């Protein structure tokens, strides 16, 4: 069982983890520096359009932590990105790595719906294995 968290995302809103109890969470941790995570995140973006009733997806970006840009910098930075559909929480404190078990990116989590971490996977991930994973949960 996972600790709740509140962070804002670049959108402005802000997303609490316990808002997700009852659904599958997948997690994305990623850093703009990381062209693996940049080549893979219109994967991201349409497993999130896709989402529907079945899960629901999120990304985390953590400023100045594992050599990330500050806040500031990363929102003016992404608006050269075009995501329609993905969600950017942004955590400053570097906490969520730490919770995780982050140790490089990407790093996909998957979360059930009773809100245990099920699984982390260092690394890349194809779109329809992240899929499957989703399924597997309960």
Same mark, same amino acid.
């Given at each position: 069982?996972?600790?709740?968290?509140?962070?804002?995302?670049?959108?402005?809103?802000?997303?609490? =983890?316990?808002?997700?109890?009852?659904?599958?969470?997948?997690? *994305?941790?990623?850093?703009?520096?990381?062209?693996?995570? =940049?080549?893979?995140?219109?994967?991201?973006?349409?497993?999130?359009?896709?989402?529907?009733?079945?899960?629901?997806?999120?990304?985390?970006?953590?400023?100045?932590? *594992?050599?990330?840009?500050?806040?500031?910098?990363?929102?003016?930075?992404?608006? &050269?990105?075009?995501?329609?559909?993905?969600?950017?929480?942004?955590?400053?404190?570097?906490?969520?790595?730490?919770?995780? &078990?982050?140790?490089?990116?990407?790093?996909?989590?998957?979360?059930?719906?009773? &809100?245990?971490?099920?699984?982390?996977?260092?690394?890349?991930?194809? *779109?329809?294995?992240? =899929?499957?994973?989703?399924?597997?949960?309960?």
């Amino acid at each position: 069982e996972v600790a709740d968290f509140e962070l804002m995302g670049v959108d402005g809103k802000t997303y609490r =983890l316990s808002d997700y109890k009852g659904k599958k969470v997948y997690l *994305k941790f990623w850093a703009s520096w990381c062209s693996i995570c =940049l080549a893979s995140l219109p994967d991201t973006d349409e497993i999130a359009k896709e989402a529907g009733d079945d899960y629901v997806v999120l990304t985390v970006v953590s400023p100045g932590h *594992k050599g990330e840009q500050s806040e500031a910098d990363f929102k003016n930075w992404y608006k &050269g990105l075009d995501y329609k559909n993905l969600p950017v929480l942004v955590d400053p404190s570097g906490k969520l790595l730490e919770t995780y &078990g982050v140790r490089s990116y990407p790093t996909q989590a998957f979360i059930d719906k009773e &809100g245990k971490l099920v699984k982390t996977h260092p690394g890349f991930m194809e *779109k329809d294995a992240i =899929l499957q994973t989703l399924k597997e949960l309960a």
